[PDB]
Amino acid sequence: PESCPPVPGGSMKLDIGIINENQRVSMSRNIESRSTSPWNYTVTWDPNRYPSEVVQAQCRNLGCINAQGKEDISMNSVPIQQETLVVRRKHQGCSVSFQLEKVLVTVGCTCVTPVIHHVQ
Amino acid sequence: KNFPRTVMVNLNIHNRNTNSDYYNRSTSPWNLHRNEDPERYPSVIWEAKCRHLGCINADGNVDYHMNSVPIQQEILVLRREPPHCPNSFRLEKILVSVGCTCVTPIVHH
Numbered sequence: 001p002e003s004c005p006p007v008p009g010g011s012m013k014l015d016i017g018i019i020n021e022n023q024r025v026s027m028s029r030n031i032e033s034r035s036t037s038p039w040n041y042t043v044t045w046d047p048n049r050y051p052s053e054v055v056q057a058q059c060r061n062l063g064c065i066n067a068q069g070k071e072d073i074s075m076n077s078v079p080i081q082q083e084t085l086v087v088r089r090k091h092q093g094c095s096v097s098f099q100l101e102k103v104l105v106t107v108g109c110t111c112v113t114p115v116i117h118h119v120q
Numbered sequence: 121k122n123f124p125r126t127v128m129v130n131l132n133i134h135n136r137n138t139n140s141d142y143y144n145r146s147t148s149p150w151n152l153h154r155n156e157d158p159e160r161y162p163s164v165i166w167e168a169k170c171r172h173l174g175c176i177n178a179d180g181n182v183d184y185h186m187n188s189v190p191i192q193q194e195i196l197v198l199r200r201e202p203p204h205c206p207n208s209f210r211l212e213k214i215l216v217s218v219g220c221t222c223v224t225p226i227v228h229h
């Protein structure tokens with residue numbers, strides 16, 4: 001029988017021991033520019049969120065880049081998404097509350113063959 | 121201004137903006153590997169692994185003049201800390217391969 005730290009009723013205790021909360025591999029990498037389905041990043045700052053740096057990707061093109069560097073629109077650039085947890089800080093007044101949230105991040109794009117439909 | 125090292129949260133996880141066959145249709149295809157951890161929330165995480173070193177060309181064959189590379193993302197997970205305790209957690213940062221993209225070996229001019 002092992003001891004547990006005290007947790008107030010109807011709560012969850014969260015230890016945030018992460019050093020460099022906003023450190024991202026996307027900063028030094030340039031695969032977003034080298035990709036056949038290239039993408040852009042939009043970076044926003046939210047001081048009431050952990051992590052505070054909000055990074056979203058957007059596909060640059062409809063189609064995919066070929067050998068010549070030209071768009072082949074018979075192929076699709078599609079965004080790929082990842083679910084993550086965030087901590088949101090809420091203020092009523094000077095009173096502060098914290099909550100866990102699940103968010104979706106568009107991390108980049110890939111090049112896929114299209115799904116084809118027919119009329120009849 | 122900064123978030124404290126330790127916070128109390130309520131029992132509700134608020135879903136924001138949440139809710140396919142790309143792993144096969146992509147010119148940089150990948151395989152998904154299951155990572156299960158009962159001490160972790162989410163307990164199951166799917167990890168992408170690029171199927172080839174090269175990319176698929178117009179003919180459907182592997183072109184090694186292009187590369188399949190992972191798109192990796194830093195995500196936050198919950199780890200029960202101490203492991204046997206139900207309501208105390210460590211917010212843990214992990215690097216996950218979400219999928220793969222096709223890249224030219226250098227940025228082209």
Ligand SMILES: *[C@@H]1O[C@H](CO[C@@H]2O[C@@H](C)[C@@H](O)[C@@H](O)[C@@H]2O)[C@@H](O[C@@H]2O[C@H](CO)[C@@H](O)[C@H](O)[C@H]2NC(C)=O)[C@H](O)[C@H]1NC(C)=O
Pocket residue numbers: 033040058059060061
């Ligand atoms: C994607 O972003 C471009 C902006 O150019 C980027 O600049 C650098 C940061 C680098 O990453 C480059 O490779 C990128 O191309 C957007 O293009 C601009 O759009 C404005 C209109 O809003 C236009 O006036 C500018 O001339 C454009 N600049 C360039 C260089 O093209 C582009 O619209 C973004 N695409 C999407 C879909 O959001």
